[PDB]
Amino acid sequence: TMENENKPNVANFEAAVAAKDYEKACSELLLILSQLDSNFGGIQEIEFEYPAQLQDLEQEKIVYFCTRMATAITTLFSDPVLEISDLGVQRFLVYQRWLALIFASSPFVNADHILQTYNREPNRKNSLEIHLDSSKSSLIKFCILYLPESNVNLNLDVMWNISPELCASLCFALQSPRFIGTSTAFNKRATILQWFPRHLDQLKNLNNIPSAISHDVYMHCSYDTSVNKHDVKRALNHVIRRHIESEYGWKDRDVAHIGYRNNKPVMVVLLEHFHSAHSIYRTHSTSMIAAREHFYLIGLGSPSVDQAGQEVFDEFHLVAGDNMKQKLEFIRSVCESNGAAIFYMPSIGMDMTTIFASNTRLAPIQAIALGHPATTHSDFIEYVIVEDDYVGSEECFSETLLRLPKDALPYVPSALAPEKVDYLLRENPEVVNIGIASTTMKLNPYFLEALKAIRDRAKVKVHFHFALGQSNGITHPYVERFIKSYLGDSATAHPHSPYHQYLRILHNCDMMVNPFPFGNTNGIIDMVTLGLVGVCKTGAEVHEHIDEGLFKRLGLPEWLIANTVDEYVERAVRLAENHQERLELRRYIIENNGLNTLFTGDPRPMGQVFLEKLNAFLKE
């Protein structure tokens, strides 16, 4: 061991490339990439120096970082001698999304200039197809640099014949970015969600693909627009199922009998991201608390759960284990000693441990809620808890829906809610400012085309202010470029800001519009707090329908809820042109708030309903 041997350092990466020490260069690259990963794209903790001009110019500094990196990576991967170890290959692909952003936030856009150095046919006649030699390493290197922004052709079928695993590894990588918003990236991912599921169904386990981003592929498919987007989840469940049976010694529990604590059947709750300052607590804690009238509640979580989070349960434990196997054995054991009646996950998808537990039999009744609002396509999950006014069509779910009364999940108000108001109802609009509250995952070509259409068609001048949640470090310059590619001078893409700065941005707006397909919840609550109105789009998925449900709870009129994109555009334009109509509507909402009603209701039905299914099951 040597002092400083694992410190990510741009100059060290560059010296290793300059010296043609391919091994030290690759490892120095992996150090920078995994740090990007830990920082969620932030560049803090990566040593580098910059021209003094960039001292206070954070975005320029970032683009400079991406540019130094892209040019070192260009030298390295263009060298025909480079041979990447096999640990190396799988490591580069888990991190592909950080290479993607390194190129996408530099002026290079993508790594196609490296790919072209791998071509062998001097014809051909298509410039965008790359005829590699037959080396294994040539295929490996092509894949690593086959980024979402690539313009180069790719035939998945041909690739799947050559190598199933390498092909699945690339498919994983291309689904895992948190920003998949441009046409080029989004279309790539769209075809992969049609093509890939029936192929992933064929793998027999997770050993030679990038499993560490499995939850990313499991969640991100929901941000697509096709009716069958979740197909990948079903096939992912089958591989996860065959993995745990072969690689672990997985035995389901016999769930014929149940146990009791204080003469109540036991509900075991496995938590992910359940802190009292965050949305899962805010939305689901009250129903869990009231479920205690009928069940003894055991919460299983990590140390990120705060005291108020732990206090929702009669009993709380850290989920123990050093790998997936042990955690699953821990979870199994709690259900065993207590003889679980119910196994419940208010959120599934965000951690991998919940995804694995869903491919498992632990209790006779097993249910999820929509903390991440997408079906599981898992045979082992019987029900989905959901508010009745938020479901679109039941055919989007493989589970049977348990449709609770629209007031059966009262929310906990955030502690950060302002206690005072200062409503700005601008009478003299040269420009109509239109705010958008969105994470980066929610951005897509369709949504951005709609906004360009509103801008193009409205007879008033509009300006869009994006208050971006996700947007951060090396992600940001790329998002901003994507947004300018549609809206030019008609848009400002604000980086991530603290809640009170986020509120000031929206406070300077005249109306809002919501992203689609995957809408807002918090953004809507915020919009109403500030006395604003806007437009949303509804559809079949819960994540599409929520906005409709909420609009209605909050006393917004039906005409702000569009059914198609061209209605969305037409209603946005209307609300933008019709100054008086807009202001009257804002005065209306300021005077009549459903807000109150979100924070109260009868939280008892989830408990009642789980009791009923358990009693049915206990009868027979």
Side-chain angles (χ1 to χ4, degrees), residues 83-132:
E83 209 121 40
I84 292 158
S85 62
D86 223 349
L87 189 124
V89 186
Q90 268 295 318
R91 285 210 84 208
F92 283 110
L93 280 164
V94 299
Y95 302 132
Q96 210 212 47
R97 59 193 170 175
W98 308 115
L99 286 185
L101 293 178
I102 281 160
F103 290 90
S105 293
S106 74
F108 294 103
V109 193
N110 63 39
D112 287 352
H113 62 289
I114 308 175
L115 295 177
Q116 291 293 352
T117 77
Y118 305 151
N119 176 60
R120 296 299 175 253
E121 234 86 1
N123 10 268
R124 36 198 143 130
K125 83 107 63 58
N126 175 39
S127 282
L128 301 153
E129 215 215 305
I130 303 211
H131 310 265
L132 314 174

Short mmCIF file of all heavy atoms in Angstrom, two decimals, residues 83-132:
data_model
loop_
_atom_site.label_atom_id
_atom_site.label_comp_id
_atom_site.label_asym_id
_atom_site.label_seq_id
_atom_site.Cartn_x
_atom_site.Cartn_y
_atom_site.Cartn_z
N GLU A 83 -5.71 -2.46 -23.92
CA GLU A 83 -6.45 -3.72 -23.72
C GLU A 83 -7.02 -3.64 -22.31
O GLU A 83 -6.28 -3.44 -21.35
CB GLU A 83 -5.52 -4.94 -23.92
CG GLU A 83 -6.20 -6.24 -24.43
CD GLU A 83 -5.62 -6.74 -25.77
OE1 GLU A 83 -4.38 -6.69 -25.97
OE2 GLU A 83 -6.42 -7.17 -26.65
N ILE A 84 -8.35 -3.74 -22.20
CA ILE A 84 -9.01 -3.53 -20.90
C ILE A 84 -9.28 -4.85 -20.17
O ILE A 84 -10.02 -5.70 -20.69
CB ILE A 84 -10.32 -2.74 -21.07
CG1 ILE A 84 -10.01 -1.32 -21.50
CG2 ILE A 84 -11.12 -2.71 -19.77
CD1 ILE A 84 -11.14 -0.66 -22.16
N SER A 85 -8.69 -4.99 -18.96
CA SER A 85 -8.88 -6.18 -18.08
C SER A 85 -10.37 -6.49 -17.95
O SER A 85 -11.19 -5.63 -18.27
CB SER A 85 -8.24 -5.96 -16.70
OG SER A 85 -8.81 -4.87 -15.98
N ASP A 86 -10.75 -7.69 -17.49
CA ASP A 86 -12.20 -8.00 -17.53
C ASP A 86 -13.03 -7.46 -16.34
O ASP A 86 -14.21 -7.11 -16.49
CB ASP A 86 -12.50 -9.47 -17.87
CG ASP A 86 -13.66 -9.62 -18.88
OD1 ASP A 86 -14.38 -8.61 -19.17
OD2 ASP A 86 -13.86 -10.75 -19.39
N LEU A 87 -12.40 -7.39 -15.17
CA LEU A 87 -12.94 -6.58 -14.07
C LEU A 87 -13.19 -5.15 -14.61
O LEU A 87 -14.30 -4.62 -14.48
CB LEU A 87 -11.98 -6.57 -12.85
CG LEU A 87 -12.51 -5.92 -11.56
CD1 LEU A 87 -12.46 -6.88 -10.34
CD2 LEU A 87 -11.84 -4.55 -11.24
N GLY A 88 -12.17 -4.58 -15.26
CA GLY A 88 -12.25 -3.26 -15.93
C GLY A 88 -13.47 -3.04 -16.81
O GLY A 88 -14.15 -2.01 -16.68
N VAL A 89 -13.77 -4.00 -17.68
CA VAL A 89 -14.91 -3.91 -18.58
C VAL A 89 -16.24 -3.69 -17.86
O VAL A 89 -17.01 -2.79 -18.21
CB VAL A 89 -15.06 -5.16 -19.42
CG1 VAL A 89 -16.16 -4.97 -20.46
CG2 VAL A 89 -13.71 -5.51 -20.06
N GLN A 90 -16.51 -4.53 -16.87
CA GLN A 90 -17.76 -4.50 -16.10
C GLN A 90 -17.84 -3.25 -15.20
O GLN A 90 -18.91 -2.68 -14.99
CB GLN A 90 -17.94 -5.82 -15.32
CG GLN A 90 -18.75 -6.89 -16.11
CD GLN A 90 -20.20 -6.45 -16.34
OE1 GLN A 90 -20.85 -5.90 -15.44
NE2 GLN A 90 -20.71 -6.66 -17.56
N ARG A 91 -16.68 -2.79 -14.74
CA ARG A 91 -16.56 -1.53 -14.02
C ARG A 91 -16.82 -0.30 -14.89
O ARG A 91 -17.52 0.62 -14.46
CB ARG A 91 -15.22 -1.44 -13.31
CG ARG A 91 -15.14 -2.32 -12.05
CD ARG A 91 -14.22 -1.70 -11.02
NE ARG A 91 -14.85 -0.68 -10.18
CZ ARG A 91 -14.21 0.35 -9.62
NH1 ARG A 91 -12.89 0.53 -9.82
NH2 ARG A 91 -14.87 1.21 -8.85
N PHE A 92 -16.29 -0.27 -16.11
CA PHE A 92 -16.60 0.84 -17.03
C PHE A 92 -18.06 0.91 -17.42
O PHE A 92 -18.59 2.00 -17.69
CB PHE A 92 -15.72 0.82 -18.28
CG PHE A 92 -14.34 1.32 -18.04
CD1 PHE A 92 -13.26 0.47 -18.07
CD2 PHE A 92 -14.12 2.67 -17.76
CE1 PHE A 92 -11.98 0.94 -17.83
CE2 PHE A 92 -12.86 3.15 -17.54
CZ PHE A 92 -11.77 2.29 -17.58
N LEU A 93 -18.72 -0.23 -17.47
CA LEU A 93 -20.10 -0.23 -17.87
C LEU A 93 -21.07 0.14 -16.75
O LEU A 93 -22.07 0.82 -17.02
CB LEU A 93 -20.47 -1.51 -18.60
CG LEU A 93 -19.98 -1.41 -20.05
CD1 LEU A 93 -19.95 -2.73 -20.74
CD2 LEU A 93 -20.84 -0.39 -20.85
N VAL A 94 -20.79 -0.27 -15.50
CA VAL A 94 -21.56 0.25 -14.36
C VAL A 94 -21.48 1.78 -14.34
O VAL A 94 -22.47 2.44 -14.06
CB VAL A 94 -21.17 -0.37 -12.94
CG1 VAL A 94 -21.42 -1.86 -12.93
CG2 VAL A 94 -19.71 -0.07 -12.55
N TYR A 95 -20.32 2.34 -14.68
CA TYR A 95 -20.15 3.78 -14.70
C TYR A 95 -20.40 4.46 -16.06
O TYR A 95 -20.07 5.65 -16.22
CB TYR A 95 -18.76 4.17 -14.20
CG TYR A 95 -18.40 3.70 -12.81
CD1 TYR A 95 -17.17 3.08 -12.57
CD2 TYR A 95 -19.26 3.92 -11.73
CE1 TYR A 95 -16.82 2.65 -11.28
CE2 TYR A 95 -18.92 3.51 -10.45
CZ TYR A 95 -17.71 2.88 -10.23
OH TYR A 95 -17.37 2.47 -8.97
N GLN A 96 -20.97 3.75 -17.04
CA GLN A 96 -21.11 4.37 -18.34
C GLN A 96 -21.78 5.74 -18.32
O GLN A 96 -21.48 6.60 -19.16
CB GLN A 96 -21.83 3.49 -19.35
CG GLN A 96 -21.33 3.79 -20.77
CD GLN A 96 -22.38 3.61 -21.82
OE1 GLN A 96 -23.51 4.09 -21.69
NE2 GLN A 96 -22.00 2.94 -22.93
N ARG A 97 -22.67 5.95 -17.36
CA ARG A 97 -23.48 7.17 -17.36
C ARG A 97 -22.61 8.37 -17.03
O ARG A 97 -22.92 9.46 -17.43
CB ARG A 97 -24.68 7.04 -16.40
CG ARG A 97 -24.31 6.77 -14.96
CD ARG A 97 -25.57 6.36 -14.19
NE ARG A 97 -25.25 5.88 -12.87
CZ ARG A 97 -26.16 5.55 -11.97
NH1 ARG A 97 -27.44 5.67 -12.29
NH2 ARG A 97 -25.78 5.14 -10.78
N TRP A 98 -21.52 8.17 -16.30
CA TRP A 98 -20.61 9.29 -16.02
C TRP A 98 -19.70 9.63 -17.17
O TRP A 98 -19.29 10.78 -17.32
CB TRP A 98 -19.83 9.00 -14.76
CG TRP A 98 -20.78 8.65 -13.72
CD1 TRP A 98 -20.91 7.45 -13.08
CD2 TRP A 98 -21.84 9.49 -13.21
NE1 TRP A 98 -21.96 7.50 -12.20
CE2 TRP A 98 -22.54 8.74 -12.26
CE3 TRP A 98 -22.23 10.82 -13.46
CZ2 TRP A 98 -23.63 9.26 -11.54
CZ3 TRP A 98 -23.33 11.35 -12.74
CH2 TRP A 98 -24.01 10.57 -11.78
N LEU A 99 -19.40 8.64 -18.01
CA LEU A 99 -18.69 8.92 -19.26
C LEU A 99 -19.64 9.64 -20.19
O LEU A 99 -19.26 10.56 -20.92
CB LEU A 99 -18.31 7.60 -19.91
CG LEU A 99 -17.16 6.79 -19.32
CD1 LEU A 99 -16.93 5.59 -20.26
CD2 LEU A 99 -15.90 7.63 -19.18
N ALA A 100 -20.90 9.22 -20.18
CA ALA A 100 -21.88 9.85 -21.01
C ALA A 100 -21.88 11.36 -20.71
O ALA A 100 -21.78 12.18 -21.63
CB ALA A 100 -23.27 9.24 -20.80
N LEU A 101 -21.95 11.72 -19.43
CA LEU A 101 -22.10 13.13 -19.04
C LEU A 101 -20.81 13.90 -19.24
O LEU A 101 -20.85 15.05 -19.63
CB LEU A 101 -22.57 13.28 -17.58
CG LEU A 101 -23.98 12.81 -17.21
CD1 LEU A 101 -24.25 12.99 -15.72
CD2 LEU A 101 -25.02 13.57 -18.00
N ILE A 102 -19.67 13.27 -18.98
CA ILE A 102 -18.36 13.88 -19.33
C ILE A 102 -18.28 14.35 -20.79
O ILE A 102 -17.83 15.49 -21.06
CB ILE A 102 -17.16 12.94 -19.00
CG1 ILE A 102 -16.85 13.00 -17.52
CG2 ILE A 102 -15.87 13.35 -19.79
CD1 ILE A 102 -16.05 11.79 -17.02
N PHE A 103 -18.70 13.51 -21.74
CA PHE A 103 -18.78 13.92 -23.14
C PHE A 103 -19.94 14.85 -23.44
O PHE A 103 -19.79 15.78 -24.25
CB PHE A 103 -18.76 12.73 -24.10
CG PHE A 103 -17.40 12.05 -24.17
CD1 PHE A 103 -17.10 11.01 -23.31
CD2 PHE A 103 -16.41 12.50 -25.04
CE1 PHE A 103 -15.82 10.42 -23.34
CE2 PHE A 103 -15.16 11.93 -25.07
CZ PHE A 103 -14.87 10.88 -24.22
N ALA A 104 -21.09 14.64 -22.81
CA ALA A 104 -22.28 15.41 -23.20
C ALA A 104 -22.22 16.84 -22.70
O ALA A 104 -22.80 17.72 -23.32
CB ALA A 104 -23.59 14.72 -22.72
N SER A 105 -21.56 17.06 -21.56
CA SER A 105 -21.37 18.44 -21.04
C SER A 105 -20.06 19.08 -21.57
O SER A 105 -19.74 20.23 -21.27
CB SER A 105 -21.40 18.46 -19.52
OG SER A 105 -22.70 18.12 -19.03
N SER A 106 -19.28 18.35 -22.35
CA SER A 106 -18.16 19.00 -23.04
C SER A 106 -18.70 19.43 -24.42
O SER A 106 -19.84 19.12 -24.77
CB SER A 106 -16.96 18.06 -23.19
OG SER A 106 -17.25 17.10 -24.20
N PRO A 107 -17.89 20.13 -25.20
CA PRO A 107 -18.42 20.53 -26.51
C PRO A 107 -18.53 19.38 -27.53
O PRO A 107 -19.14 19.55 -28.56
CB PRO A 107 -17.43 21.56 -27.00
CG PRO A 107 -16.70 22.01 -25.81
CD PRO A 107 -16.67 20.88 -24.86
N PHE A 108 -17.95 18.23 -27.19
CA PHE A 108 -17.89 17.03 -28.03
C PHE A 108 -19.20 16.28 -28.22
O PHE A 108 -19.35 15.52 -29.19
CB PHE A 108 -16.89 16.06 -27.45
CG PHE A 108 -15.49 16.56 -27.50
CD1 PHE A 108 -14.88 17.05 -26.35
CD2 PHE A 108 -14.79 16.59 -28.71
CE1 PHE A 108 -13.57 17.54 -26.39
CE2 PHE A 108 -13.46 17.08 -28.77
CZ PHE A 108 -12.86 17.56 -27.60
N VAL A 109 -20.12 16.45 -27.25
CA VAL A 109 -21.44 15.81 -27.26
C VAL A 109 -21.38 14.31 -26.96
O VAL A 109 -22.09 13.80 -26.11
CB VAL A 109 -22.22 16.11 -28.60
CG1 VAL A 109 -23.65 15.73 -28.47
CG2 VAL A 109 -22.10 17.57 -28.97
N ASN A 110 -20.53 13.59 -27.68
CA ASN A 110 -20.46 12.14 -27.56
C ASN A 110 -19.05 11.71 -27.91
O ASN A 110 -18.17 12.56 -28.19
CB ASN A 110 -21.52 11.48 -28.48
CG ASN A 110 -21.29 11.77 -29.96
OD1 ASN A 110 -20.16 11.79 -30.43
ND2 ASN A 110 -22.37 11.96 -30.70
N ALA A 111 -18.83 10.40 -27.90
CA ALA A 111 -17.51 9.82 -28.08
C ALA A 111 -17.44 9.16 -29.47
O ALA A 111 -16.67 8.20 -29.68
CB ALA A 111 -17.26 8.80 -26.97
N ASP A 112 -18.23 9.66 -30.41
CA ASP A 112 -18.24 9.05 -31.76
C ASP A 112 -16.92 9.21 -32.52
O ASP A 112 -16.56 8.36 -33.34
CB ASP A 112 -19.41 9.58 -32.58
CG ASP A 112 -20.74 9.02 -32.13
OD1 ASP A 112 -20.76 8.10 -31.28
OD2 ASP A 112 -21.78 9.46 -32.63
N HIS A 113 -16.20 10.29 -32.24
CA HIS A 113 -14.86 10.46 -32.77
C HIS A 113 -13.86 9.38 -32.28
O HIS A 113 -12.87 9.06 -32.96
CB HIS A 113 -14.36 11.86 -32.46
CG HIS A 113 -14.24 12.14 -30.99
ND1 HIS A 113 -15.34 12.31 -30.17
CD2 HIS A 113 -13.15 12.32 -30.20
CE1 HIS A 113 -14.93 12.57 -28.94
NE2 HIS A 113 -13.61 12.57 -28.93
N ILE A 114 -14.11 8.80 -31.11
CA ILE A 114 -13.30 7.65 -30.71
C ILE A 114 -13.81 6.40 -31.43
O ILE A 114 -13.04 5.59 -31.97
CB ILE A 114 -13.29 7.45 -29.18
CG1 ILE A 114 -12.92 8.75 -28.47
CG2 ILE A 114 -12.29 6.35 -28.77
CD1 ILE A 114 -13.02 8.66 -26.92
N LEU A 115 -15.12 6.25 -31.49
CA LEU A 115 -15.67 5.07 -32.14
C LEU A 115 -15.18 4.92 -33.59
O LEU A 115 -14.94 3.78 -34.04
CB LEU A 115 -17.20 5.06 -32.08
CG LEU A 115 -17.82 4.94 -30.68
CD1 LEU A 115 -19.32 5.01 -30.77
CD2 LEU A 115 -17.36 3.72 -29.87
N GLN A 116 -15.03 6.04 -34.30
CA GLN A 116 -14.70 6.01 -35.71
C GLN A 116 -13.28 5.49 -35.87
O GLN A 116 -12.94 4.95 -36.91
CB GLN A 116 -14.87 7.38 -36.40
CG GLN A 116 -16.31 7.94 -36.57
CD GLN A 116 -17.19 7.15 -37.55
OE1 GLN A 116 -16.72 6.25 -38.24
NE2 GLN A 116 -18.48 7.49 -37.59
N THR A 117 -12.44 5.63 -34.85
CA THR A 117 -11.09 5.09 -34.95
C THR A 117 -11.10 3.57 -34.87
O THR A 117 -10.07 2.93 -35.08
CB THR A 117 -10.08 5.64 -33.90
OG1 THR A 117 -10.31 5.00 -32.63
CG2 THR A 117 -10.14 7.15 -33.80
N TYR A 118 -12.24 2.98 -34.55
CA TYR A 118 -12.31 1.53 -34.46
C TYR A 118 -12.82 0.90 -35.76
O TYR A 118 -12.90 -0.32 -35.86
CB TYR A 118 -13.20 1.05 -33.29
CG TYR A 118 -12.87 1.56 -31.93
CD1 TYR A 118 -13.89 1.71 -30.96
CD2 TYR A 118 -11.56 1.85 -31.57
CE1 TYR A 118 -13.58 2.17 -29.65
CE2 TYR A 118 -11.25 2.31 -30.29
CZ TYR A 118 -12.26 2.46 -29.34
OH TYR A 118 -11.92 2.91 -28.10
N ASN A 119 -13.20 1.73 -36.72
CA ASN A 119 -13.69 1.23 -37.99
C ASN A 119 -12.57 0.66 -38.86
O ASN A 119 -11.46 1.17 -38.85
CB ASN A 119 -14.42 2.32 -38.74
CG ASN A 119 -14.87 1.87 -40.12
OD1 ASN A 119 -15.65 0.91 -40.25
ND2 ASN A 119 -14.38 2.54 -41.14
N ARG A 120 -12.88 -0.40 -39.60
CA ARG A 120 -11.91 -1.07 -40.49
C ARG A 120 -12.20 -1.00 -42.01
O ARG A 120 -11.26 -1.06 -42.81
CB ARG A 120 -11.62 -2.51 -40.02
CG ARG A 120 -10.95 -2.62 -38.62
CD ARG A 120 -9.59 -1.93 -38.60
NE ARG A 120 -8.97 -1.90 -37.27
CZ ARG A 120 -8.85 -0.82 -36.48
NH1 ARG A 120 -9.33 0.38 -36.84
NH2 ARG A 120 -8.26 -0.94 -35.30
N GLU A 121 -13.48 -0.87 -42.41
CA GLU A 121 -13.85 -0.82 -43.84
C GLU A 121 -13.79 0.58 -44.45
O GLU A 121 -14.58 1.45 -44.08
CB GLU A 121 -15.25 -1.40 -44.06
CG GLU A 121 -15.30 -2.52 -45.12
CD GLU A 121 -15.00 -3.90 -44.53
OE1 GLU A 121 -14.77 -3.99 -43.29
OE2 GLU A 121 -14.99 -4.91 -45.29
N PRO A 122 -12.88 0.80 -45.42
CA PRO A 122 -12.82 2.16 -45.97
C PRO A 122 -13.83 2.47 -47.09
O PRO A 122 -13.47 3.14 -48.05
CB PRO A 122 -11.36 2.28 -46.48
CG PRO A 122 -10.64 1.02 -45.98
CD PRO A 122 -11.73 -0.01 -45.86
N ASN A 123 -15.08 2.02 -46.96
CA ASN A 123 -16.15 2.38 -47.94
C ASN A 123 -17.27 3.40 -47.50
O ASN A 123 -17.04 4.61 -47.59
CB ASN A 123 -16.69 1.15 -48.73
CG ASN A 123 -16.19 -0.21 -48.18
OD1 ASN A 123 -15.16 -0.74 -48.63
ND2 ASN A 123 -16.93 -0.77 -47.21
N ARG A 124 -18.45 2.97 -47.01
CA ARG A 124 -18.73 1.60 -46.56
C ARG A 124 -20.18 1.02 -46.74
O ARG A 124 -20.39 -0.15 -46.43
CB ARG A 124 -18.20 1.39 -45.11
CG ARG A 124 -18.32 2.61 -44.17
CD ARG A 124 -17.42 2.53 -42.93
NE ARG A 124 -16.89 3.86 -42.60
CZ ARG A 124 -16.91 4.44 -41.40
NH1 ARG A 124 -17.41 3.84 -40.33
NH2 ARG A 124 -16.39 5.65 -41.26
N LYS A 125 -21.18 1.77 -47.22
CA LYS A 125 -21.10 3.16 -47.65
C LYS A 125 -21.63 4.14 -46.58
O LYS A 125 -21.49 5.37 -46.73
CB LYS A 125 -21.85 3.33 -48.99
CG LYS A 125 -23.38 3.53 -48.90
CD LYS A 125 -23.78 4.99 -49.23
CE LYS A 125 -23.43 5.39 -50.68
NZ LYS A 125 -24.06 4.50 -51.70
N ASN A 126 -22.23 3.58 -45.52
CA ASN A 126 -22.74 4.31 -44.34
C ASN A 126 -21.62 4.69 -43.35
O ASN A 126 -21.03 3.80 -42.72
CB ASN A 126 -23.85 3.45 -43.67
CG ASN A 126 -24.40 4.03 -42.36
OD1 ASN A 126 -24.59 5.24 -42.22
ND2 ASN A 126 -24.68 3.14 -41.41
N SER A 127 -21.34 5.99 -43.23
CA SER A 127 -20.33 6.55 -42.30
C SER A 127 -20.56 6.29 -40.81
O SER A 127 -19.63 6.44 -40.00
CB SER A 127 -20.23 8.05 -42.49
OG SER A 127 -19.48 8.36 -43.64
N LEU A 128 -21.80 5.95 -40.47
CA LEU A 128 -22.26 5.83 -39.10
C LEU A 128 -22.26 4.38 -38.65
O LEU A 128 -22.68 4.08 -37.52
CB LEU A 128 -23.67 6.39 -38.96
CG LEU A 128 -23.91 7.85 -39.35
CD1 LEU A 128 -25.37 8.08 -39.80
CD2 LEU A 128 -23.50 8.75 -38.19
N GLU A 129 -21.84 3.48 -39.53
CA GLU A 129 -21.67 2.11 -39.08
C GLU A 129 -20.21 1.81 -38.96
O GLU A 129 -19.39 2.24 -39.78
CB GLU A 129 -22.38 1.09 -39.95
CG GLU A 129 -22.91 -0.07 -39.09
CD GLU A 129 -22.86 -1.42 -39.79
OE1 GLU A 129 -23.44 -1.51 -40.90
OE2 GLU A 129 -22.22 -2.37 -39.24
N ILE A 130 -19.88 1.08 -37.92
CA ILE A 130 -18.51 0.85 -37.59
C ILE A 130 -18.23 -0.64 -37.72
O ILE A 130 -18.77 -1.45 -36.99
CB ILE A 130 -18.20 1.49 -36.24
CG1 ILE A 130 -18.56 2.99 -36.35
CG2 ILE A 130 -16.77 1.26 -35.84
CD1 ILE A 130 -17.76 3.92 -35.55
N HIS A 131 -17.40 -0.97 -38.71
CA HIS A 131 -17.01 -2.35 -38.97
C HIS A 131 -15.72 -2.62 -38.20
O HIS A 131 -14.63 -2.25 -38.62
CB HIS A 131 -16.87 -2.62 -40.48
CG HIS A 131 -18.05 -2.18 -41.30
ND1 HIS A 131 -19.07 -3.03 -41.66
CD2 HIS A 131 -18.35 -0.97 -41.85
CE1 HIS A 131 -19.96 -2.37 -42.39
NE2 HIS A 131 -19.55 -1.11 -42.51
N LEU A 132 -15.87 -3.24 -37.04
CA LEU A 132 -14.75 -3.53 -36.15
C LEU A 132 -14.06 -4.75 -36.67
O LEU A 132 -14.67 -5.55 -37.37
CB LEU A 132 -15.27 -3.87 -34.74
CG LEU A 132 -16.34 -2.98 -34.12
CD1 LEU A 132 -16.81 -3.58 -32.81
CD2 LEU A 132 -15.80 -1.59 -33.90
#
